[PDB]
Amino acid sequence: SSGLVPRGSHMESAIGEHLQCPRTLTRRVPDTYTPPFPMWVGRADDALQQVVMGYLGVQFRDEDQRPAALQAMRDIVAGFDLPDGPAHHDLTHHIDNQGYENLIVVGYWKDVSSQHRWSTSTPIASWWESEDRLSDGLGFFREIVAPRAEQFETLYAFQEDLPGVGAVMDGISGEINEHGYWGSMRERFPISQTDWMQASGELRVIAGDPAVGGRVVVRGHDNIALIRSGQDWADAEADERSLYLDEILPTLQSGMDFLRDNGPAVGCYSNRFVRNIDIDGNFLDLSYNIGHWASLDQLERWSESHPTHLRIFTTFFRVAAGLSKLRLYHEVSVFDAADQLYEYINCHPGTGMLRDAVTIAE
Amino acid sequence: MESAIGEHLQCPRTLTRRVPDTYTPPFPMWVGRADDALQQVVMGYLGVQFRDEDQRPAALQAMRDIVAGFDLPDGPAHHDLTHHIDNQGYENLIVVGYWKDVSSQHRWSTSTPIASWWESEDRLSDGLGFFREIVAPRAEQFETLYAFQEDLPGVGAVMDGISGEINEHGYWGSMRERFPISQTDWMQASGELRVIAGDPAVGGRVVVRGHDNIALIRSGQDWADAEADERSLYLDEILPTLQSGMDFLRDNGPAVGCYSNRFVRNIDIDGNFLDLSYNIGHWASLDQLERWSESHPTHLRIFTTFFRVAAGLSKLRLYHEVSVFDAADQLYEYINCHPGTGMLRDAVTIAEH
Ligand code: HEM
Ligand code: HEM
């Protein structure tokens, strides 16, 4: 039956038991398929219906704005302690291709109604709506997206202390079957059992004007995809730190720069390559991509063809056997139009979903 | 757009593709077409092996003898000739013949001039190694892919013509989808590659039986029409990456599920080289071949190098054919070959399975 070390059809599935159904869209590997290295996925029971991933940002241009920016980031984080705040968060920094610095606090909620109560609560809404946000001279944004349980997948190359959305799930799976081949990401989405997750519609400005600053609201469209793909080398030994910093990162950086600067050509609305920071703005040894894509298909096409991702993909297969403390993972999600809110205050026109959004009158 | 799967071979699907029906490939490719008359083909690879330079005249005469046999009634519809030196330093002349049906190849093999030659005691006293690796995929059990639309080599030479631009290519997993049987069947491998007569370690006559869904790839390169600048791109940029991958599979086959990897150059009847080459690769399963092509750094380096230089290409002809077979539709026979030859290397003895 099932051995000590299960293989093929005896291995666990990425798809939670309560979300399984007979596949009308079938897998691309035979029943005997057994991956060459272990990967695990986040588990949650049926109580997790729909999560919220809220990326809350503070943007600035000049050195003399850094104190005000850090103060604002700290105020956002303080707001997380209030009732209905997110169950997990982390803080990051990056400089965008227009030279603006961006601090982003990402929060994860286990329930949509909870996030909505938090956002509407007086302390939070008064801060977000305040005229102070305009007089601050800083840019702010909220890119808040809510995939149902069937609409996201996770993959971790480790088992303990899961970052991102894994932190708000119940626990970790055993070693899963649906990984190690192109097309496996799609297969890991429970909705993939029956649905092609095809994009339709257009990113559209529904309030304000990206070109002139002030307050701007962009509506998403069906099956925009969001990838968070991360690297953590903080506790690794010197040799694994070198593997990452010297052998992986320069190529990863090249690929991230490519998506950042060639987005419209490949279907990437926004690409950010961010470094974790502490509450004081100082760098930590963790990083990740935050990538918003016009479709899951376009993300698939890029990942399986661009030389940068192919090189690092192949490095991982090589070092997989010996990996001890270097931590790599991703989470990918798709969303209905109604389950996405992209709001900007005094951000430059290239920020996030402002860049490719169809203006209020085309 | 046109489908890789012939109209008569399209059926109600129980297994789906990995892309939606709206997928559009980023560059054109074409496939071989044949109607319902082509039911099952035979690919017969007939080899002559030798170690020492003084055996070359006898080896070449043997090759000419085999080719003359191809001219008899029920001989193959198409053939080509190749040379390579294997990782044991032996030279190998291989004549591949393609037949459009199983019965004709059987009539041919059992016909007195052919059977008498293969069964002769002379084969044991020639000092040469001889082999026959003969496999017969049904129409639903092979796929082709050509980056050109004329004079198809290999199995394409025995099909009826060429398609228009096809939908099912340009993403990993597209090869599987070009097999008509993928509409309903995983082409899962089962069974063992097994010695059923003789002992590879001892020589003489050895017979190996295949297993269900062994896969065979012939992936080819033809630069015979290239002018100087394009020859440089192929020989100086592409070929070193191809060479690296071929060396890898030749020398690390068990690790990735490749039973046999040959990288061969076409020759004319005199044994002189032509500017065409191909891989002949036998694999333990179609999915092991898929894993190598899509995740091994060797093929990925070939892939990326190709796209880096592609804008300077025009006359270079690249193609492949891949087949899977039932156990019964494979025959691997060796006479006085070294123990690493073809299916002899990895085949297990009767008591080892
Ligand atoms: C340290 C950096 C990275 C490494 C070493 C790496 C490596 C890999 C590996 C080994 C896989 C296959 C996982 C499995 O199924 O077992 C994979 C999948 C994937 N990666 Fe990355 N990756 C990195 C960063 C990224 C980034 C920043 C992106 C953003 C576009 C990306 C996009 C993808 C996608 C879309 C897949 C799924 C492919 C599929 O299953 O169809 N990766 N990556
Ligand atoms: C210079 C020689 C080669 C070049 C430039 C090259 C390039 C490529 C390209 C561009 C593709 C994707 C084709 C498409 O779908 O449009 C491909 C697919 C493939 N190649 Fe190669 N290749 C070469 C040699 C080989 C060889 C010798 C092998 C033998 C194992 C091989 C095995 C494969 C396989 C199995 C696929 C199918 C992948 C799939 O669709 O799942 N290739 N190759």
Curated annotation (Swiss-Prot), chain B:
Binding positions for heme b per the UniProt entry: H299
The keyword Heme appears for this protein: yes
Annotated residues for binding of an aliphatic aldoxime: S219, H320
InterPro entries xrefs: OXD
Active site residues of this protein: H320
Annotated source species: Rhodococcus erythropolis
Activity regulation (UniProt): Active when the heme iron is in the ferrous state. The activity is enhanced by reducing agents, such as Na(2)S, Na(2)S(2)(O4), 2-mercaptoethanol, and L-cysteine and supplementary additions of electron acceptors such as flavins, sulfite ion, and vitamin K3. The effect of various chemicals on the enzyme activity is different in the presence and absence of the reducing reagent, Na(2)S, which acts not only as a reductant but also changes the substrate specificity of the enzyme.
Temperature-dependent activity: Optimum temperature is 30 degrees Celsius.
Catalytic activity: an aliphatic aldoxime = a nitrile + H2O
EC number annotated for this UniProt entry: 4.8.1.2
Record's protein name: Aliphatic aldoxime dehydratase
